[PDB]
Amino acid sequence: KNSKIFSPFRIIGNVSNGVPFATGTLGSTFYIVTCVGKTFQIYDANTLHLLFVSEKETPSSIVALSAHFHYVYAAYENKVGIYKRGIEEHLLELETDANVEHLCIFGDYLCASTDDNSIFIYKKSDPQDKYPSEFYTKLTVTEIQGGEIVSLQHLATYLNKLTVVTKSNVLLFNVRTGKLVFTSNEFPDQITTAEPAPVLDIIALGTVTGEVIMFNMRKGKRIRTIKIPQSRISSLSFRTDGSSHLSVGTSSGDLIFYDLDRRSRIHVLKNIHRESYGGVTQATFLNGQPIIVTSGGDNSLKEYVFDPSLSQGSGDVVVQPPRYLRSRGGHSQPPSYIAFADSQSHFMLSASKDRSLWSFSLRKDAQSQEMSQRLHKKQDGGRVGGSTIKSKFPEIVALAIENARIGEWENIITAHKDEKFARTWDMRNKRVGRWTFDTTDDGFVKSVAMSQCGNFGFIGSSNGSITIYNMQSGILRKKYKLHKRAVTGISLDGMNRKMVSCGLDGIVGFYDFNKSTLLGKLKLDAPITAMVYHRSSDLFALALDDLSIVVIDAVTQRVVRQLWGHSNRITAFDFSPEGRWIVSASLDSTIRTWDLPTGGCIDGIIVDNVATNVKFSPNGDLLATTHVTGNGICIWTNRAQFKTVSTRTIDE
Amino acid sequence: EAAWIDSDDEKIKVPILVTNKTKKLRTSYNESKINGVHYINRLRSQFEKIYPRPKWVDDESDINALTKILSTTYNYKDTLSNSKLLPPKKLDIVRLKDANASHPSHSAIQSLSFHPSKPLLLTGGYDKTLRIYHIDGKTNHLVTSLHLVGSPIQTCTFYTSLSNQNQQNIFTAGRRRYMHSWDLSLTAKIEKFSRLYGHESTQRSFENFKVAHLQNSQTNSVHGIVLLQGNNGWINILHSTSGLWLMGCKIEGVITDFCIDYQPISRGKFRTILIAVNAYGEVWEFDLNKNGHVIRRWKDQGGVGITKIQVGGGTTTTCPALQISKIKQNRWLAVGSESGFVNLYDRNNAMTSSTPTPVAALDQLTTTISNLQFSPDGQILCMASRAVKDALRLVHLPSCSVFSNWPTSGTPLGKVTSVAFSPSGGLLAVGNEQGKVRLWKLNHY
């Protein structure tokens, strides 16, 4: 459903999704266009900077994309879009209902293979224009000639011909006369990849059992065969700087390098990408260069470089192994928690189910960096426990950042899944901190908070006990015991004077903080799942179990609004930075905006994925949502920062 | 030469001078349009001078057995289960949850034994209670727990008979003139053995006992014996159900330790041998399926303060046989001493010499050997000392070489005061003086 407050801006934190990317070459530089769901992203291969993002989201997922000099050809559901600088220049509708799923571009021809084994040829109108635009003919690979088309390529110096790689065969079409020139002999196992060699009229085929064939497309024979047992081959690339190496890419995430001249195996990069997300999905040498760009389905794009040889006379036999060079990446699993790091809306902290805490930049995607989990030394000098085989921390339930004393000491306080202590982090250093706050009642951490002096962190355990630690020195200061069931929300005043806790027994406790008294206790009518404290207006909102949002102020301890309308469990909510609205999101696939002055629902968005996190910026710039599927962070901009919206209630 | 000709390139006719890239592949300044096969050859030579022709394409197309097998393989060692016996010098041992972590011990854990069949671990110490833990990986819980008042326990053993394998007794004893026997029934019926049937002067403390199997040798009827180490040189063997004193075996010197070996004879008949060591180093072997008479008397080569003998490689008292046909002869015999020296004898040849030489004398840990236990397969020996911290080694054998990667400097072994091997899982339990059983799993099993 279209909205009237927030309009979609971008989905940040995404680098790849395991569509095989395309490389392109403007002049002597290289760009790398990778698909992220329904948009592509162009990267500058010398530094992996994000040059361009495609202007509109395609109506379905981009499934095959190529790149000549200035133009990028992206094939999604039925049609091929021709894009320059992100902005779409042309759209080629195919005459079928079959999904286009391969394409090549050579000459005046764009050739797009669908999944019903038909091939659509498109021609330029006059050979001076920029992209193939008019329909020319249709080719068909029937079941007699070959299997399913597994690749579609044009190996060089072949005057208007096309190498079609089917699952068992290699056909060669003349795309002007519409003819089938040559059909090879069969192959005893199903071939998955193809790459044209820089040797003349040689293609390289990669099978579903472990072998690379070097087919000579003019003799009709195979030149040589390379066997990699029990490995499905997903990429093939060739080195073109006077060193005849081949790089094969294996769907258990391996990148194997071969010398073709002296028939040895140079090196293997093991676990270069995750097998569970597809292995190495596209690996290609930037040509003339000893650097190879890999990309996998785990939302990661890397570069590896070959240093020059260490022997000053031999060289060709002492090949130094490939080392790592720059890389970009994001979360490999959908994020589980979201926060904004500062009031400027520049960085945002983001934790995922793949057990990593990233810090993503809303201004420039090169500044996105993974917060490191390299632990400090123990304070006394004793040994730290844990496994020797280091793994990442359990996935993050909650976090609370308060950069009042930033750079001074620990700054982020975070709570993990089914473990009884809350770690700290430093956002300035972008690393873990020295302290892990215990709950001291053998209960898991259900909530965290920290004061805006930056001195105090608050832990709320599942046995109902708030413990207040000092963020500088890491020791227990106080411990309140009011609740008996799990404490799901803690917050404190902007003047460190009254704190407010809410547990899932449905009591909101109001404590004085300087004196350790309680000021009161208010029993609601459902267990409370989440609190958000708007700190300037002193109004906090509770997501109750009866699917209402109770807005209650902390000064006079009354329920002052009660917002009804959600049909399932409220996953998240957040206040406007001016504290006028509250945006919630719930498991009925909806996001609502409530004007708590008038107490009604301003806007509603039906979004197909359920939004698990909603956060406003600390200025009124952006909304950041986080959904069930999708490894990134969806970013919306409120149009009411530029116009004024009517606080008049919607329905249906 | 070529496997196809398409008959379209010959009648095509290209221009040349329209674009700057094709403007270079002319051979004259008057050429403007050329034939298709000529044009294909021009840009074939141009492709060949952009990317120069390598040697792997025209060099070769597809006693070399080793080179071929190396060019196909990627791993070069035995894979997972086609090993069946341990690799030396590098263990494979993960750490599980500490077994008594569920219910803490109030004393140093003095003895420790697994069940022969069930997943049960019995711990016990000087706080005069004994605890049984259902062990697994994650959650080692406490089955039951029995606190004998006024009776600190020092040795506790699961006994399970060979006839019906349905008794499941626990024999436990400390520095007392009695020994308790709990009959496992899942109230608790325990009995007390407190009568040496005329032999109370030579047995003033029931601390060092061991439980074993004995055959009648006129019927094929087995029964358990407990064996008590007494003052002078005496071992008092008595029935494990009736408590009747059966026989006694006296060695000459200060009796320090003893172990039980079994050897099969025929179908359904075996023979029990008691192996008892002087402090000085001389070893007696008593046949006790007949009257307790000496059959062999030999001497440990070296060794002057002898604390602990153990056998292994077959059925010991800590790897017990559940069925009488599964009784095996022990291969190895380790005699561990006060200096930390452990002689190791191979009884496949060292039952004949009467001054037999050890296959190796280990010297890796330097203080008094207080535990040494063989893994049930008989491929690891575990030396352990309760005198300094972290004094435990697992020596691989037959190679007689200590594993060098475990334990490390960060293994929380503690002051190792007991150790036990699982009969089936390949699993160490190590109890220290703080009251903690730590638990490890050997991934070879």
């Binding site: 290289f30 000099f69 208007n160 040509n287 | 390139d9 141009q46 952009i50 990317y51």
Partner: peptide, 28 residues
Amino acid sequence: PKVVREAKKVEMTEARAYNADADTAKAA
């Protein structure tokens, strides 16, 4: 002293590439 496995600073170079736009011809 062991051998020095230090990495050089890598800069890209100017490479020539065959473009396939000359691999398409029209008939009269």
